[PDB]
Enzyme design. Structure first.
Site, PDB file in Angstrom:
ATOM      1  N   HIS A 139       2.284  -0.282   1.648  1.00  0.00           N
ATOM      2  CA  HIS A 139       2.500   0.411   0.382  1.00  0.00           C
ATOM      3  C   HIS A 139       2.052  -0.391  -0.824  1.00  0.00           C
ATOM      4  CE1 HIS A 139       4.755   3.513   2.392  1.00  0.00           C
ATOM      5  NE2 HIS A 139       5.708   2.696   2.784  1.00  0.00           N
ATOM      6  N   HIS A 179       5.342   6.284   7.575  1.00  0.00           N
ATOM      7  CA  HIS A 179       5.029   6.510   6.179  1.00  0.00           C
ATOM      8  C   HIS A 179       3.541   6.312   5.921  1.00  0.00           C
ATOM      9  CE1 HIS A 179       9.277   5.066   6.282  1.00  0.00           C
ATOM     10  NE2 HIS A 179       9.422   6.164   5.562  1.00  0.00           N
TER      11      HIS A 179
HETATM   12  C1  LIG Z   1      11.156   2.464   1.337  1.00  0.00           C
HETATM   13  C2  LIG Z   1      11.440   3.118   2.656  1.00  0.00           C
HETATM   14  C3  LIG Z   1      10.569   2.873   3.783  1.00  0.00           C
HETATM   15  C4  LIG Z   1       9.537   2.060   3.783  1.00  0.00           C
HETATM   16  C5  LIG Z   1       8.704   1.988   4.992  1.00  0.00           C
HETATM   17  O1  LIG Z   1       9.086   1.921   6.125  1.00  0.00           O
HETATM   18  N1  LIG Z   1       7.382   2.054   4.680  1.00  0.00           N
HETATM   19  O2  LIG Z   1       6.411   2.046   5.647  1.00  0.00           O
HETATM   20  C6  LIG Z   1      12.436   3.981   2.864  1.00  0.00           C
HETATM   21  C7  LIG Z   1      13.446   4.416   1.883  1.00  0.00           C
HETATM   22  C8  LIG Z   1      12.968   5.665   1.181  1.00  0.00           C
HETATM   23  C9  LIG Z   1      14.700   4.721   2.684  1.00  0.00           C
HETATM   24  O3  LIG Z   1      14.684   5.631   3.509  1.00  0.00           O
HETATM   25  C10 LIG Z   1      15.882   3.879   2.524  1.00  0.00           C
HETATM   26  C11 LIG Z   1      16.998   4.161   3.317  1.00  0.00           C
HETATM   27  C12 LIG Z   1      18.136   3.401   3.237  1.00  0.00           C
HETATM   28  C13 LIG Z   1      18.194   2.312   2.353  1.00  0.00           C
HETATM   29  N2  LIG Z   1      19.365   1.544   2.255  1.00  0.00           N
HETATM   30  C14 LIG Z   1      20.491   1.812   3.123  1.00  0.00           C
HETATM   31  C15 LIG Z   1      19.540   0.457   1.276  1.00  0.00           C
HETATM   32  C16 LIG Z   1      17.071   2.034   1.557  1.00  0.00           C
HETATM   33  C17 LIG Z   1      15.945   2.800   1.655  1.00  0.00           C
HETATM   34  K   LIG Z   2       1.092   5.745   8.584  1.00  0.00           K
HETATM   35 ZN   LIG Z   3       7.415   2.889   7.196  1.00  0.00          ZN
END
Ligand SMILES: CC(/C=C/C(=O)NO)=C\[C@@H](C)C(=O)c1ccc(N(C)C)cc1
Ligand SMILES: [K+]
Ligand SMILES: [Zn+2]
Ligand SMILES: [Cl-]
Ligand SMILES: [Cl-]
Ligand SMILES: [Cl-]
Ligand SMILES: [K+]
Ligand SMILES: [Mg+2]
Length: 360
Positions: A139, A179
């Site tokens: 990202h 993602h």
């Molecule tokens: C940023 C991301 C994935 C990145 C990835 O894998 N990119 O490739 C996912 C976010 C939207 C998410 O789902 C999330 C869920 C729980 C959480 N906490 C429990 C603190 C913090 C974030």
């Molecule tokens: K991907």
């Molecule tokens: Zn991911």
């Protein structure tokens, strides 16, 4: 089974990369234990001793500049010296980032580990390799951090590979993290020397990172037209049948026509069965079959780079199965697609048939 002439698999893992952490929330899903659990499982499965151990190193600032702006390098570098209040404020300047005093160094180590692994592959010291690294990279954009990623490890590695061979070295990046790798797409969007193929949960733009840049009709720009392939999933859970079909109909035909000289896998394991952030069902045996297919490209020169993946058991089993394939083990034994998955595959075929004779 391996004998004197059998190819060699490299492995890089350094516990220094565990030092990046969320100082406010020890249960944040992007845990230090992600890498130590994967490494441990490689020991349990007797994979580690079959691999050539490649050392980590730091990326240099000049190497970071292959893909990132001087501003972004400077700002992340400055976080090494920040107090918690400033680390919190800086992280809040980005979408989904936490920062500790060790984050910059860990991001440098993730990149340098992959540079060393690409170098080992391209010089013939090993045939293929696996990089058990964090924080993730895909990202990260030229000018910003995002989504747990500081620097774009895979993109940097592609450029680094070109820098130590020749500019035209054809690099395929296959991004099977659930993602979209927005940063990788954008870095290479005008580039015909780096083919980016991402499979990702899309949900009409509703799924992180929440941009329509991830749809199938983003095919690349200028000389890069045709060299950006987005395979977006809509309609909830996908698994082995859908990923195998996407590889059969799209990833492998396009890749073979491109004829890469190096394959990098942005190997998140968040499309895995059990992952609570991805919600998909790819099995360890599914990842093994994807790996085994990619091994047929680039004279076997494949580097598997950890991205996301948050169920510690799932990522450990899944990445270990990939290493087992790289080492030459037999693929394990392994269905109608979800209707929306057939629709997605056919949409990508329509979008890319103008650019790839293998699809016509
Ligand atoms: C940023 C991301 C994935 C990145 C990835 O894998 N990119 O490739 C996912 C976010 C939207 C998410 O789902 C999330 C869920 C729980 C959480 N906490 C429990 C603190 C913090 C974030
Ligand atoms: K991907
Ligand atoms: Zn991911
Ligand atoms: Cl071992
Ligand atoms: Cl403070
Ligand atoms: Cl260090
Ligand atoms: K491209
Ligand atoms: Mg170029």
């Amino acid at each position: 089974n391996a004998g004197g002439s059998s190819p060699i698999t490299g492995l890089v893992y350094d516990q220094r990369m565990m030092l990046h952490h969320n100082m406010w929330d020890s249960h944040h899903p992007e845990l230090p234990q992600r890498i130590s659990r994967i490494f441990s499982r490689h020991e349990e499965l007797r994979l580690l001793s079959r691999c050539h151990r490649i050392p980590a190193r730091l990326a240099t600032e000049e190497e970071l500049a292959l893909c990132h702006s001087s501003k972004h390098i400077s700002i992340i570098k400055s976080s090494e010296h920040m107090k918690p209040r400033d680390l919190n404020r800086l992280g809040d300047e980005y979408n989904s980032i936490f920062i500790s005093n060790e984050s910059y160094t860990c991001a440098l180590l993730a990149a340098g580990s992959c540079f060393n692994s690409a170098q080992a592959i391209l010089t013939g010291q090993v045939r293929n390799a696996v990089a058990i690294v964090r924080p993730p990279g895909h990202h990260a954009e030229k000018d910003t951090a995002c989504g747990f990623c500081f620097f774009n490890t895979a993109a940097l590695t592609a450029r680094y590979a070109q820098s130590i061979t020749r500019e035209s070295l054809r690099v395929l990046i296959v991004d099977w993290d659930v993602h979209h790798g927005n940063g990788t797409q954008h870095i290479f969007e005008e580039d015909d020397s780096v083919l980016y193929i991402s499979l990702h949960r899309y949900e009409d733009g509703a799924f992180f990172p929440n941009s329509e840049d991830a749809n199938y009709d983003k095919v690349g720009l200028g000389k890069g037209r045709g060299y950006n392939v987005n395979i977006p999933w809509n309609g909830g859970k996908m698994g082995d049948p859908e990923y195998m079909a996407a590889f059969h109909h799209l990833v492998m035909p396009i890749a073979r026509e491109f004829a890469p000289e190096l394959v990098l896998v942005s190997a998140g394991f968040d499309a895995a069965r059990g992952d609570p952030l991805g919600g998909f069902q790819v099995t360890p045996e599914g990842y093994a079959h994807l790996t085994h297919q990619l091994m047929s490209l680039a004279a076997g020169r494949v580097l598997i780079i950890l991205e996301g993946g948050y169920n510690l058991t799932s990522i450990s089993e899944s990445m270990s199965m990939c290493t087992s394939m790289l080492l030459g083990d037999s693929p394990p034994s392994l269905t109608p697609l979800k209707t929306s998955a057939t629709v997605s595959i056919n949409n990508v075929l329509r979008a890319h048939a103008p650019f790839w004779s293998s699809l016509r």
